[PDB]
């Protein structure tokens, strides 16, 4: 039972309206990572996009300045037992 | 053919069960070229290679025991479908180098083990 | 033990289908035995659709998942029979068909997995 | 159950001390054919040699002139059921 969840999720670079995030890949065949993000306060709608499994970085654009954003990343990965399945997420908070 | 059916099922169940244990234990250790799925194909190649040389020299064995080893055990133990999805998954992951390597190591390796099986039993004779 | 029965019930059905298909058809075209090809192409097609289907239905029982993939597709497909056919052609000096067998089995099985995956993906 | 035994075994050409034999191949994967030959009057040792499966012809040299020779051909062939096995022979007689 190897962990399919990424580790070391962090913001490497940031402008007022964008974040560059990177993560350590899990020791499994990741087909794609799903990056989700939304305003930590309340119930502004959370958006998601995918990046290919080869990539271990992503740019989140069009954010609001000075706003607390919750950012999660989870994988869609091949394993012998489960075939394609979705991992649990790793999550961080970051104020622009 | 009901006696023949039991040879396929008894042999096949032993092979499939060995594959299931080996794959679930080991495949996760090196996900670029899952070793459990490789080992079962290389082992099945080795068994059927020796079977190739052995059944030639012993032509009057029961078709039951021959069918239990080849169609049963080696048939159940080896796998092409698991080999395909592993490669397919690597292809969708953009991991072409290991997708190619998997195809070569499985194919080239399984023939080498069949040759080793054949030529060991041939030379020991 | 429940998992063990999924592998055996699925595997026995797969091995039996392979046994009937191979003994019936393989002799018709011995350069590229069609029974052994069909079972690999069919297993690729089944596991390709299984790939796309189990993703969209993540809370199915591991029993039913294990019965299709490790059982049926595992039992139905074969690498050992594929090897001896090629090996036999290699010892017969029949390199062109030995090569063709390797390409048709490998390239074909991925195409059937793609067709299985992309049909179920395209169908919502 | 396709026949793995060759057919149409015959001498295409012959000198006093050699024969050229040809045969129609069986509809199976032949690895090699084994050609055997000896003097029909059964008190002289039978010799055998192999030819590759691609070949459907063979030359038998060093025979005696005016002598009845029995000539057989059998295959070593791959089949799904039996793996490598030896077929029954097809046999002919020929006087040099
Ligand atoms: C040779 C014989 C075998 C023939 C049959 C094989 C069929 C294999 C299916 C490949 O699937 C595609 O693989 C791409 C990667 O290879 C993925 O691209 C994804 O990843 C790329 C980067 O790796 C990005 O550029 C793309 O935008 C992104 O969709 C894409 O999603 C996926 O559907
Ligand atoms: C990857 C690993 C694959 C290993 C495959 C083993 C190949 O086996 C050899 O193949 C040769 C080629 O078919 C045969 O030669 C046979 O055929 C040749 C070509 O006609 C002749 O020159 C030889 O004399 C004749 O023995 C030879 O017997 C056989 O052991
Ligand atoms: C024998 C061959 C059969 C041919 C059948 C026709 C197939 C034509 C290609 C399908 O188009 C692809 O569909 C993927 C969706 O299935 C998209 O992946 C997207 O979605 C994937 C997850 O579903 C992610 O992994 C990718 O990164 C993301 O680009 C991908 O962009 C797109 O090009
Ligand atoms: F397959
Ligand atoms: F593989
Ligand atoms: F194999
Ligand atoms: Na199998």
Residue numbers in the entry:
A (entry chain C), D (entry chain D): 1 to 96
B (entry chain B): 1 to 125
C (entry chain A): 2 to 125
Sentences from the paper on this structure:
Fluc channels, present in all classes of life except higher animals, allow passive transit of F- ions across the membrane down their electrochemical gradient. Bacterial Fluc channels are constructed as small, dual-topology dimers; the two subunits, each of ~120 residues, span the membrane in opposite orientations to form the functional complex. These channels are notable for this unusual architecture as well as for exceptionally high F-/Cl-selectivity.
The moderately conserved Thr114 lies at one end of the polar track, distant from bound F- ions, and its substitution by Ala abolishes channel activity, as if its hydroxyl group is necessary for ushering the anion into the narrow pore from the aqueous vestibule.
